[PDB]
Design a binder for this molecule. Structure first.
Ligand code: HEM
Ligand code: HEM
Ligand SMILES: N=C(N)SCCc1cccc(CCSC(=N)N)c1
Ligand SMILES: N=C(N)SCCc1cccc(CCSC(=N)N)c1
Ligand SMILES: [Zn+2]
Lengths: 416, 414
C-alpha cells in the first residue's frame, strides 16, 4: 500500500496515512534503534545560543521554504510576487546576512507554528490567533507595556482570546530580547529552612532570581511573581504586574462546602513566555503566546503533581478517604473532585476554560480537518492524552505520528 | 549515543546503555516517531516455509547461548564451549537446532523481562515454565492448556506461568492457538450490527460457530478454544466450567451495582503472541500472570468499543450525563475500578491496582538500572488508562527498544 506511516484509530477501526511527515525538514530524537519519544527535552530542537551569524547558505534555504509556504497559503505559488519576494530575501541576506518578514508573513508563520505544535491539544483554534507585531520594541520598559497590553486583550475580563506578541528577532552578534519567567503569570516558590517550599516548587529558581534582582519577596502560597524583562545587551530590569491586570479565580467545590476554605486559587491567563518562535530561519527569542486552560492543567498537574502543590493528600483527608491503602483509590477520588472544582470555579467566575472531554473531542475534529488539508497532523501522544481519565477520552485510541514542522515553537536555553 | 533519562518528580538522571545491545529495529526514524502505534507495519514474523539463513540464525543462537551461560556464571567454561559446538553442529546439518529445558526456562523469563509494555516485570524472576514441546496433537494442546489453567489459577492465588508448544519448523504449519486469550467472552453480532457480549471478540466468536460451536446468547459466555496442529484444520475444545474461575462484580457501598450483573474472569493469559529465543520461534506459547484492576475496570468494561458500560453506571449513580464538564465519566470510571478491586479481593483472587503496580515497576526500573544499565519501556503502555499523572511512572522518562529473547506479535492463522 502507501509508503507513508499507517495510522489507526482502534475505537472506530478507521485508517489514515500521514503524508505530511515527509515535509519535516528537521530530525527528532528517535532512531530505528530506540524510541526516545517520552523525553520532555531531547537534545534536538533545543535552540542553543548560536552567537556568530548563521551560514547564509542554510538560512537562505530555510527562508526560501517559508516564503514558499506563504505564497502557497495565499494560492499564488509560482507567481511574480512570489519569485520577487524570493529575490528580495536572497538579496537582503546577501548584503546583511539576515532578512526580515512582511507583516502578513509574520501573522501566517505565527499561526503555522501553533498549527505545527505536536504537544498542543487545542489546535482546532489555530486559525483564530491575534498577532501583535512588536518588532519595533527597543526597551525592556517598552516590553512591559506590550505584555501588559497583551494580558489586557487576552484576558478580556474572562472571555479569553488567544494571542501572541512578537518582539525583535535575534540579530547578528547582538543581545536577544528575552523574558526570564517561563510564563507571564507565575506563583512564587519560597525555599524554606526545613528544606520544603512554600508556593509553587516549579518556580523556585525564577523566584530566587527576582530576589537577586531587587524584588521584595512576600511569603504567601500564591504570590504573583514580577517579570524579568531583558532588552538587547542589557541586564534584566524588573517589573511588577498591576494586580488588576492579573485576573485570578478562587476555587470552590459545587457540593463540598469546605473546599472553598482551602484557599486554593489559580490565574486565568496561561501564557508561555520562554519559548522561541522560529520562522523561515529567523529566530524570535521573546514571543509570548497565550490561550485558555484545559481543566486538567490546573486541577491535575499544577495542583496534584508530587513536585507542585501536591494537594492530593490534604484533599483526600478532608473527604475522609482511606489514604493508608492504594486500593481505596483515594488518589483517583480526590483528583476527580479537585478537577470538578476547577471547572466549577471557572464557569462560576465566567472565565474561559475547557474540560479534557470537550477538548480531546475537538482535537479529534482537528485531526480530521488536518487530514484533508495537509495529509496528516504531527502529534505527541503522551501530551495529547489527558493526565486523568486517559482512555475515557477519544485521543487515547487514536494512533499518532510525531515530527517537526516549521514554523515552530522550540525550547531555548535560559538566558542566565 | 547513550540517552539521558530523567524523572521529573525527583530530578534524578540515568544513562541507558542497555539499548546498545539492541540488534532489532523499531518503527521510529529521526524523521518521525511512530511509537504510539500498537502493531508493527513490517516488524512482523513472516512465514516459515523455508529455513532461516544459517549464518544469521547461528549468530542469534550463539548470542543467546552466551547469554545463558553468563547467567549461570559459567561463561567460557567447558560446558559453554561444547554447547556452542552442539548448536553449530546441528544448525549446519539441519538448518536449525533445539533448546535444552533449562535454556528454555532462561529464555522465557528473559522474554518477559525484555517486554517493554509490561508493567508487572518486577515478577519476571518468578515464572513457572511448562515444557510442552512434547506435544503432537490439538487434543494434547488442550490437556496441556487445561493444566496451565488449573495451575496458574490455583484456586484464586494466581501464579504466573507459560506453556511452550513446539517451535516453528520450515515448510510446516505452526501449532497455533486461534484465541487471543485462553479465556474470552463471545461477541455476538445481533440486530442492527450492534453487539451482545464482548465486541473485541466478534471475529473469534464467529470462527468458532463456523466450526460447530453452539453459541449462547449472553454477555459473558465463555468461548471455546480453537487449537490447531500443523497443517490441520483447527479443532474445537470446550473448557470445563470448574476450571474457568470468575469474579462477580459488586460495589463496596453502591448496593445496586451487583444488580448490573457484571462479571470477569480471573486468568489473564495471552495465547496468540510468539516467543522468540535464540532465533527459534515458538508460535504457541501461552502465558499468564494476574490482572491489574484497570485492565478490567477501565479498558475492558469502559472502552467505547468494548462493553462500554460507562453511561449505565452514570445513570444509576444518578449523574448529570447531559454535559462533559460534570465529569460524570471520570466519576463512574472510578467506582467501576473500585468495584473490580473490591470484588476480586472479596473473592480472594489475585489482583493489583494501578498505584501499587506502578510503584513496584519504579523499583523494577531501579533494580534493572543497576543490573543491566537500563530497562526498555513503552511509556504509553506503562502509564495506566486513568489517573495517569497520579502514578509515579507518568513522571518518568523511558527508552524503548527491542531485546531478545522477546515476545512478538504474529499474523492471525486464518
Ligand atoms: C486556545 C486554547 C488552548 C488550549 C486549551 C491549549 C492547551 C494546551 C495544553 C493542555 C498543552 C499541554 C500542557 C502541558 O502538558 O504542560 C499545550 C501545549 C502547547 N500549546 Fe496549546 N493550547 C491552547 C492555545 C495555545 C496557543 C494560542 C498556542 C500558540 C500560539 C499554543 C501552543 C502550544 C505549544 C507550543 C505547546 C507545547 C509547549 C511545550 O512543549 O511545553 N497553545 N496547549
Ligand atoms: C504478574 C502479573 C502481571 C501483570 C500485573 C502484568 C500486567 C500487564 C499489563 C497491564 C500490560 C498491558 C495490558 C494492556 O494494556 O493490554 C501487560 C502487557 C504485557 N505483559 Fe505483563 N503482566 C504480568 C505478567 C506477565 C507475564 C507472566 C508475562 C510473560 C511471561 C507478561 C508479558 C507481557 C507482554 C508481552 C505484554 C505486552 C503484550 C502486547 O503487546 O499486547 N506479563 N502486562
Ligand atoms: N496551556 C494552555 N491552555 S495555553 C498555551 C500556553 C501554555 C500555558 C501554560 C502551560 C503550557 C504547557 C508548557 S509550559 C512551558 N513550556 N513554560 C502552555
Ligand atoms: N495483562 C496481565 N495482567 S498478564 C499478561 C497477559 C495479558 C492479558 C490481557 C491483555 C494483555 C495485553 C494485550 S492482549 C494480546 N496481545 N492478545 C496481556
Ligand atoms: Zn519514537
Amino acid at each position: 500500500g502507501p509508503k507513508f506511516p499507517r495510522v489507526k484509530n482502534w475505537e472506530l477501526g478507521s485508517i489514515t496515512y500521514d503524508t505530511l511527515c515527509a515535509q519535516s525538514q528537521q530530525d527528532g530524537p528517535c532512531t530505528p534503534r530506540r524510541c526516545l519519544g517520552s523525553l520532555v527535552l531531547p537534545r534536538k530542537l533545543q535552540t542553543r545560543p548560536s552567537p556568530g551569524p548563521p551560514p547564509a547558505e542554510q538560512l537562505l534555504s530555510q527562508a526560501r521554504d517559508f516564503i514558499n509556504q506563504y505564497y502557497s497559503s495565499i494560492k499564488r505559488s509560482g507567481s511574480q510576487a512570489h519569485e520577487e519576494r524570493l529575490q528580495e530575501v536572497e538579496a537582503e541576506v546577501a548584503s546583511t546576512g539576515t532578512y526580515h518578514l512582511r507583516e502578513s508573513e509574520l501573522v501566517f508563520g505565527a499561526k503555522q507554528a501553533w498549527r505545527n505544535a505536536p504537544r498542543c491539544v487545542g489546535r482546532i483554534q489555530w486559525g483564530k490567533l491575534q498577532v501583535f507585531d512588536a518588532r519595533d520594541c527597543s526597551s525592556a520598559q517598552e516590553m512591559f507595556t506590550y505584555i501588559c497590553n497583551h494580558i489586557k486583550y487576552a484576558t478580556n475580563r474572562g472571555n479569553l482570546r488567544s494571542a501572541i506578541t512578537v518582539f525583535p528577532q535575534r540579530a547578528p552578534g547582538r543581545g536577544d530580547f528575552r523574558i526570564w519567567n517561563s510564563q507571564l503569570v507565575r506563583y512564587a516558590g519560597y525555599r524554606q529552612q526545613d528544606g520544603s517550599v512554600r508556593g509553587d516548587p516549579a518556580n523556585v529558581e525564577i523566584t530566587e532570581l527576582c530576589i537577586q534582582h531587587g524584588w521584595t519577596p512576600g511569603n504567601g502560597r500564591f504570590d504573583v511573581l514580577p517579570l524579568l524583562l531583558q532588552a538587547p545587551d542589557e541586564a534584566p530590569e524588573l517589573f511588577v504586574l498591576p494586580p488588576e491586570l492579573v485576573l485570578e479565580v478562587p476555587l470552590e467545590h459545587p457540593t463540598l462546602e469546605w473546599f472553598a476554605a482551602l484557599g486554593l486559587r489559580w490565574y486565568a491567563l496561561p501564557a508561555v513566555s520562554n519559548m522561541l518562535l522560529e520562522i523561515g530561519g529567523l529566530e524570535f527569542s521573546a514571543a509570548p503566546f497565550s490561550g485558555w486552560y484545559m481543566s486538567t492543567e490546573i486541577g491535575t498537574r499544577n495542583l496534584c503533581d508530587p513536585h507542585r502543590y501536591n494537594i492530593l493528600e490534604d484533599v483526600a483527608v478532608c473527604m475522609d478517604l482511606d489514604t493508608r491503602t492504594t486500593s481505596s483509590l483515594w488518589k483517583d477520588k480526590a483528583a476527580v473532585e479537585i478537577n470538578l472544582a476547577v471547572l466549577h470555579s471557572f464557569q462560576l467566575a465566567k472565565v474561559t476554560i475547557v474540560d479534557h472531554h470537550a477538548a480531546t473531542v475537538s482535537f479529534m475534529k482537528h485531526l480530521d480537518n488536518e487530514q484533508k488539508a495537509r495529509g496528516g497532523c504531527p502529534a505527541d501522544w503522551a501530551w495529547i492524552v489527558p493526565p486523568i481519565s486517559g482512555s475515557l477520552t477519544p485521543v487515547f485510541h487514536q494512533e499518532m505520528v510525531n515530527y517537526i514542522l516549521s514554523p515552530a515553537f522550540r525550547y531555548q536555553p535560559d538566558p542566565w
